[PDB]
Structures are given as C-alpha cells and as structure tokens.
Design a protein around this ligand. Structure first.
Ligand SMILES: O=c1ccn([C@@H]2O[C@H](COP(=O)(O)OP(=O)(O)O[C@H]3O[C@H](CO)[C@@H](O)[C@H](O)[C@H]3F)[C@@H](O)[C@H]2O)c(=O)[nH]1
Length: 392
C-alpha cells in the first residue's frame, strides 16, 4: 500500500486526497491519515482515511478547544500521530506527507522504522527550503527542535529509533516535491533538485446541487465569491454582494470556513457550502477569491477571469501571478470597499480578459498525480502500479 498523511486546512488536504484517489485508480491500496474535518471528503471519493487529532476548522472544535497547530498542544499532537499512524502504515511501501511539521516528523519517524521511502510535498514555491536563506533554515530547525524535539525523541525511543535533530530538515526532507502547476508557479531555472510534479487535482465528478443548478439556469452567469478555509475581510459579504450587483451580475457566495451569509432576501444571490469548483467555475462570469494555491489553480484551469483579494501568507504571490498572467486583477489590499471591488470586477469582466483566461486555462496540466505515482513506483522499486502506468 501507500500511506498519505497531512495536517492542515483544505488546501493542504485536497492535493493529498487527489493523489490517494489517483493511486487507487492505478491499482495501489492508498490510504490516508488526516484531521477529522475530512471524513466526508475522503468517503465521497472512495478513499480510506483514518482521522487523527483535533479538527482544523475552529467551528468543528468545541468552544475554547485549541487548534492542532497551537504551540500549547504540540506534545499531545506528536503523541496522537505516533498512536494512530502505526495501524495505518502497516503494509505500506511508501509515504507521502504535507502540512503541520510536528505531525510530519512523527510520520517520517514511523517510515524510518519500517525502512520505507518518505516524501514531503510543498504546494507553493516560496515554501521550498531552497527558497529560504541558510539563516532562515537554521532558525526553523532550532525552533522545531526546541518546541517539540524532546516529545518527538521520546516517541522515537518508544519504537527503538535513535534521537533525531534538525526537525525542519527532517520533516521537509532535503528535497521536497513541489505539487504546483509550473505555469502558475514557475521554478527558478537554477533549481535542478526540486521535482515539480504539477498540481494534484482530483477530477471532480460530484453533481452540483439542485439549488445551484436551478440558480445557474435561471439567469445570466453569476460571479462567485469565496475565501476558502481562511478569514474573510470585514463586511466581506456586504461589500462583495453590493460590488457584484453594481456590475449588473448575480452572486454565488461561498460561506467557507468564515461562515459568510446573505445580507438580504435578494433572489439574485445564492449562498453555497461545498461545491464542485471544476464544474461551477466553467459556468461563472468571474471568481473573487483569496488566492489560495488550490483555489487559484482551479480558477485558472477553469478559465474564469479572477479578482484575487489576498489575506495572508502565499496569497499575495498568487494575486501577483494572476495579474502577471493577465487573467485577473490583483486587488490592492486585503479589505475591499464596494468601490474598489466594483472597479476590479469591471476590469475582470471585459471580453479581453475573458479570452486571456480561456487561453491560459489550456496550459494548466491536470496530470500531476500521474507524475507523482510514477515517482512513487520508482522509489518503491529501488505489479499493478507498473502495469497501470505502462498503460497510461
Ligand atoms: O467548495 C469548495 C471549496 C474548495 N474546493 C477545493 O478545495 C481546494 C482549496 O485549495 P486552497 O489551496 O485554496 O485551500 P485553502 O485551505 O482555502 O487555502 C490555504 O491553504 C493553501 C495551501 O497551503 C494556501 O495556499 C492558502 O494560503 C490557504 F489559506 C481547491 O482545490 C478547491 O477547488 C472545492 O472543490 N469546493
């Protein structure tokens, strides 16, 4: 089998589910360890998953219950991963991981014990160890060792392993994979070490809800607005609904983890939960979003013009990439006003940008999981999988 693990938000998780599903299609018994948020997602695509640790979404936890990434609970997190992974990793020939470092180091430790290959994956190039300075890498290693090195070493001893240090190096490996699209996220030409597979995208077969289908059929193509797993700006729903209205468009508002909702009973708005983005984004006039790696990838592949309203982290990078590609507008700042978002939307709604977005869509590859599957085949070899890939 192959074990696929991670602890993080939807963006950290969805690529892993894509890889797991692709491996199962290719005849490999891929299974997962993920936070409990993702039980439904894994089940609906037929991927076995074992829930590990605290829920990542605040609303999925108890009031006052700290997230898995909180420094206060790191000892508990390490223990939980060492407790639950053994049953899942048994009979596996390789492991692929992303996300939270203390969990990743636990997983690699168990891979080390079994003598099976471990691969860590990053989703945005700015997060590659080789894109950090030596001083930064030193700092990350020291912080990890200090914060949870003792806990990791106690559990390593429990299974007979020697102690380990430099936990950033250990968890990320010396050369993590980059599961990111090369058009959206080009790698510097001097980097010969990083294996860039392309994005890991699950071909989405889920139907749209009757309500969303009805909404799409009942009028002109709407604008989608959503902020993914992250926070939304102040008055996000009001500003977005009023700005989209100002452009003469209907609105599909994704509630997201922020829990956005309607501002009135207007029938020109539909509030949605989880949806098939691959299908929906082909049927909208534009997408206003936060600039998450996965969301940007999906919007770009669908060919919908964009307005990126970046909140934090790697999101300004994606806003800049979208602007540079000419397929959308990088909104100036994290908190739009009706006026600023309306202006950005007007720009994103031109025939020219529609054509540019349509053209760039065709350049985004969707076969990154096949690249990763072949890389795994080669790592394990050093059957059904080899036969399936030869067929491809
Ligand atoms: O209704 C829905 C909602 C989502 N999806 C899919 O979930 C994926 C979300 O990916 P994304 O990377 O934007 O995740 P997110 O957790 O919001 O963002 C961060 O995690 C990212 C990765 O680390 C990071 O780039 C960023 O800064 C984050 F905040 C993407 O493939 C969507 O198309 C869906 O199919 N239907």
């Amino acid at each position: 089998g192959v074990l696929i693990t991670g602890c993080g938000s939807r963006g950290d998780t969805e690529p892993l589910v894509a890889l797991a599903a692709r491996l199962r299609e290719l005849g490999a018994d891929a299974r997962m360890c993920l936070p409990p948020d993702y039980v439904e997602r894994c089940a609906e695509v037929g991927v076995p998953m074992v829930p590990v640790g605290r829920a990542v979404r605040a609303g999925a936890r108890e009031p006052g219950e700290l997230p898995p990434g909180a420094a206060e609970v790191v000892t508990e997190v390490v223990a939980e991963w060492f407790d639950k992974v053994p049953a899942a990793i048994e009979g596996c020939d390789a492991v692929v991981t992303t996300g939270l470092l203390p969990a990743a180091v636990a997983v690699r430790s168990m891979a080390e014990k079994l003598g099976i290959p471990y691969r860590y994956t990053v989703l945005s190039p700015d997060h590659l160890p080789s894109e950090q300075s030596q001083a930064e890498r030193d700092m990350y290693n020291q912080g990890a060792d200090r914060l949870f090195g003792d806990a990791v070493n106690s559990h390593r001893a429990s299974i007979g392993l020697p102690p380990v240090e430099h936990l950033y190096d250990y968890g990320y490996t010396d050369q993590p994979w980059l599961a990111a699209d090369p058009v959206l996220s080009p790698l510097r030409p001097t980097d010969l070490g990083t294996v860039q597979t392309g994005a890991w995208i699950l071909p989405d077969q889920r139907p749209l809800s009757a309500e969303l289908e009805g909404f799409l059929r009942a009028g002109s193509p709407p604008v989608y607005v959503g902020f993914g797993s992250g926070p939304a700006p102040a008055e996000a729903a009001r500003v977005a609904i009023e700005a989209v209205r100002a452009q003469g468009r209907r609105v599909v508002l994704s509630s997201g983890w922020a829990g956005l909702g309607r501002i009135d009973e207007g029938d020109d708005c539909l509030v949605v939960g989880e949806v098939n983005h691959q299908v929906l984004f082909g049927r909208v006039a534009a997408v206003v979003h936060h600039g998450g790696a996965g969301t940007t990838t999906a919007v770009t592949r669908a060919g919908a013009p964009q307005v990126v309203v970046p909140q934090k982290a790697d999101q300004p990078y994606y806003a800049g990439r979208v602007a540079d590609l000419g397929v959308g507008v990088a909104h100036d700042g994290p908190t739009p006003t009706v006026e600023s978002l309306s202006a950005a939307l007007a720009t994103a709604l031109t025939p020219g940008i529609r054509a540019r977005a349509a053209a760039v869509a065709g350049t985004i590859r969707t076969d990154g999981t096949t690249v990763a599957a072949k890389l795994l085949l080669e790592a394990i070899s050093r059957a059904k999988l080899a036969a399936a890939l030869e067929h491809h």
